Design a protein around this ligand. Structure first.
Ligand SMILES: [K+]
Ligand SMILES: [K+]
Ligand SMILES: [K+]
Ligand SMILES: [K+]
Ligand SMILES: [K+]
Lengths: 82, 82, 82, 82
């Protein structure tokens, strides 16, 4: 699968996660972007996390849609850097 | 291994984790489902975590049974979405 | 690599992590075992974490020695269960 | 890719993450090294995490540059130990 397509897919995940956290959980755009990376990378510091049932359901969807996409993106980036 | 079988396996893990956390640690069904996804995806925010020895042992079993199952499920989903 | 050998390797990691956390950080044997699984699986709730410089260095060694070993163990277990 | 080259790459990531956290977030060199391992391994305890917008952006860059590099390093180490 072309590297650039994987890039677009991970960008779409990032937009989805950031806007979702911002609107559902009410955190700033910057915090929401940071939380999205931390979540889809599976780092999960827990400095930010959803507090609402909708936010919890949303987070599960982001986990399912985002962790695999991010994993493929990082491995494709590895190839270009290495 | 057929994608639908992997789906059933991950659903079984989700049921096991959710019911276990709910009954052992006493959190709501929704929180317990959320905690199960967060745990088997290895995100591990730590907003919820077991506080009892039984809950700790149970969590180790969920980790062993669930992380691999979830990993295979997400990669199979990737194929269908990509 | 034989599945049983991978089993022994992950058990050795578990012993190393549990005894190390118990003696360096002073937590109970049960908490230390739980923390070891949570760490080598990369779940990392953060309900327990090292507070001392020695504990921090030790945790880095466990991360390096344990995450790969655990990953191989879970995938080998997948095969037997599936 | 030669194992020793992967070693140098992961060391470079470790230096980048440690110095960055130390200077941006103001934590000690030891805490910063520990946080770097915890982050690139995706353990993410959350005992330490960035509190500033710059630190958040920096952490996202470390996540992208470091998680894949660390993953390849651990698997290469597995081979030598096994
Ligand atoms: K984690
Ligand atoms: K955490
Ligand atoms: K993998
Ligand atoms: K993780
Ligand atoms: K975590």
């Amino acid at each position: 699968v072309p590297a650039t397509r994987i890039l677009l897919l991970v960008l779409a995940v990032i937009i989805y996660g950031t806007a979702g956290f911002h609107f559902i959980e009410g955190e700033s755009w910057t915090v929401s972007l940071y939380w999205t990376f931390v979540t889809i990378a599976t780092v999960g510091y827990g400095d930010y996390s959803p507090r609402t049932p909708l936010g919890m359901y949303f987070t599960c969807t982001l986990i399912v849609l985002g962790i695999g996409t991010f994993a493929v993106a990082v491995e494709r980036l590895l190839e270009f850097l290495i």
